[PDB]
């Protein structure tokens, strides 16, 4: 499994497409695409445990976390597998996403295919918040858009 794709959509203007590419099974995952309809600023961006979107937050589960860690920023030693930090929307409400991540994968225990990718209204506090919820979800507020990560090749 070498390429994956996700169509982010929601009830509002936020919508986007995100691509994933991983040449080696234990190489990094390249993550790129665009999200539009965002307010200017930083938005929480992560993968949930499940891709079941029948019941919203409830069915998609917590952050994808097979190693049972606490929440963190993507560069942090302590983080969920699903934690991809923040995307940044410019003044025209467009977030151009360009990420390399070493923790997510397109195969094995960290495989994100078939899970929900989500973009949130507020910034992820990257677990650096002074409350317990910070160490669980990063306090990114409500979900603006989501999609299931599917096989692209």
């Amino acid at each position: 499994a070498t390429k994956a794709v996700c169509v982010l959509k929601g009830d509002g203007p936020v919508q986007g497409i995100i691509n994933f590419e991983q040449k080696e099974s234990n190489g990094p995952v390249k993550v790129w695409g665009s999200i539009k309809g965002l307010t200017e600023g930083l938005h929480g961006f992560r993968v949930q445990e499940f891709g079941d979107n029948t019941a919203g937050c409830t069915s998609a589960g917590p952050h994808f976390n097979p190693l049972s860690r606490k929440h963190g920023g993507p560069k942090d030693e302590e983080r969920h597998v699903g934690d991809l930090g923040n995307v940044t929307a410019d003044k025209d409400g467009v977030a151009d996403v360009s990420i390399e991540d070493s923790v997510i994968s397109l195969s094995g225990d960290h495989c994100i295919i078939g899970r929900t990718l989500v973009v949130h209204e507020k910034a992820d506090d990257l677990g650096k918040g002074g409350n317990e919820e910070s160490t669980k979800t990063g306090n990114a507020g409500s979900r603006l858009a989501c999609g299931v990560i599917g096989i692209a090749q």
Binding site: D52, N53, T54, I113, V148, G150, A152
Partner: protein, 226 residues
């Protein structure tokens, strides 16, 4: 072996209802979670119709999936504009290489047999076009001739499907349901088929009784027919 979802007086009410049915090897019960496990060679549609019971996921990891099936194109004949959801597939692994599909369809404009398939890729950016080749064709049709509770000129259907595939092999692919348009002419898009689809998603398989789909809000935007 499959798991079904349903006080202490409730318990024997159900075990009763099932007893004269053959092919059943054992019955186990967990009234706490309100579920029931049944190990058998007997059809699940038999188990459920006899009883209200839904197919549910076991606790087994990566054994359950779901696909929310939405239209991608705008159809002339399709004037339901509050949601593009037309169908729901609940998928449970019931064997080592055996899987069961709880399919519901509701709110389609044309009565008919709809055909289910799994396509190779879970890329729904371009609707069916981007999902690539058929990967598994389901021979059995979804019979949609029942009128839909969503109003007149709308139809519904339901069926269980089966495949010799483990759940993990379906994750990330596309589940696609389609029917030839009766009137391809009236459709400007040069589109010949009425299709709705979704990426097959990992699921905990802890589904509630009513087969429904909510918006990112939480509001219910679609449900299986009564």
């Amino acid at each position: 072996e499959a798991t079904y979802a349903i006080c202490e007086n409730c318990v024997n009410d159900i075990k009763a209802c099932l007893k004269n049915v053959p092919g059943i090897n054992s019955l186990n019960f967990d009234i706490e979670q309100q579920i029931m496990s049944v190990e058998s060679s007997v059809a699940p549609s038999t188990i459920i119709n006899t009883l209200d019971a839904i197919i549910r996921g076991a606790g087994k990891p990566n054994s359950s999936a779901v696909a929310i099936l939405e239209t991608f194109q705008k159809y002339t004949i399709d004037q339901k504009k509050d949601t593009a959801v037309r169908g729901l597939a609940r998928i449970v692994q019931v064997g080592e290489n055996k899987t069961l599909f709880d399919i519901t369809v509701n709110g389609v404009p044309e009565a008919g047999n709809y055909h289910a398939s799994i396509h190779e890729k879970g890329d729904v950016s371009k609707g069916v076009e981007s999902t690539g080749k058929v990967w598994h064709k389901f021979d059995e049709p979804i019979e949609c001739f029942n009128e839909s509770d969503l109003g007149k000129n709308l139809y519904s259907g339901k069926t269980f499907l089966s495949a010799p595939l483990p759940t993990w092999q379906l994750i990330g692919r596309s589940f696609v349901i389609s029917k030839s348009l009766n009137h391809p002419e009236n459709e400007p898009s040069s589109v010949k088929d009425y299709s709705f689809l979704g990426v097959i998603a990992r699921s905990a398989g802890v589904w509630e009784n009513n087969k429904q789909v909510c918006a990112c809000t939480g509001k219910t935007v679609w449900a299986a027919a009564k």
